[PDB]
Amino acid sequence: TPFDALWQRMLARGWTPVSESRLDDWLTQAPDGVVLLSSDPKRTPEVSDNPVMIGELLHEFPDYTWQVAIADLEQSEAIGDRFGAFRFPATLVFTGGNYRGVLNGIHPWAELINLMRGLVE
């Protein structure tokens, strides 16, 4: 399937799978982290690019001890519903164990970095 490919692509980066039921536990052991929420790559082939970007965007803020989490299709909807994220691909941002916001949509790389600063600062 297409998503299975993406999922393996992310697993290879070492990112950890997470379910809504365990998110809080993961969060407590990752004060500075990011949760990637995805949709079916078939419906929107843009969900495939999101991952690669986020990877880069992260090392743009070394000040944090970033940890990446990924949710499958079902869990992404679960977690999303809990945070009001109804625009996938989405990325939940957490700093110091605190939810700062969500990066949704697709913007130029320069438009992304500044959007993050508005979340972690």
Q: How many residues does the chain have?
A: 121
| Cβ neighbours for 119, distance < 8 A, ≥ 6 positions apart | 93, 95, 100, 101, 103
* Domain 1-121: CATH class, spelled out: alpha beta
Helices in the chain by DSSP H: which ranges? 2-12, 20-28, 49-58, 73-83, 109-120
> What angle (nearest 5°) sits at the alpha carbon of residue 65, between those of residues 121 and 55?
85
In whole angstroms, give the CA distance from residue 67 to residue 88: 20
| Structural method | X-ray
Domain segments of the chain as ranges: 1-121
* Tokens 């070492």 found at: 14
Based on C-alpha coordinates, what's the Rg of the chain? 13
Resolution of the experimental model in angstroms, please? Answer: 2.7
In angstroms, what CA-CA distances link 9 with 22, 29, 63? Answer: 22, 24, 26
Six-digit token pair at 108? 């130029």
Which among 92, 101, 87, 1 has a CA at the least distance from the CA of 46?
A: 87
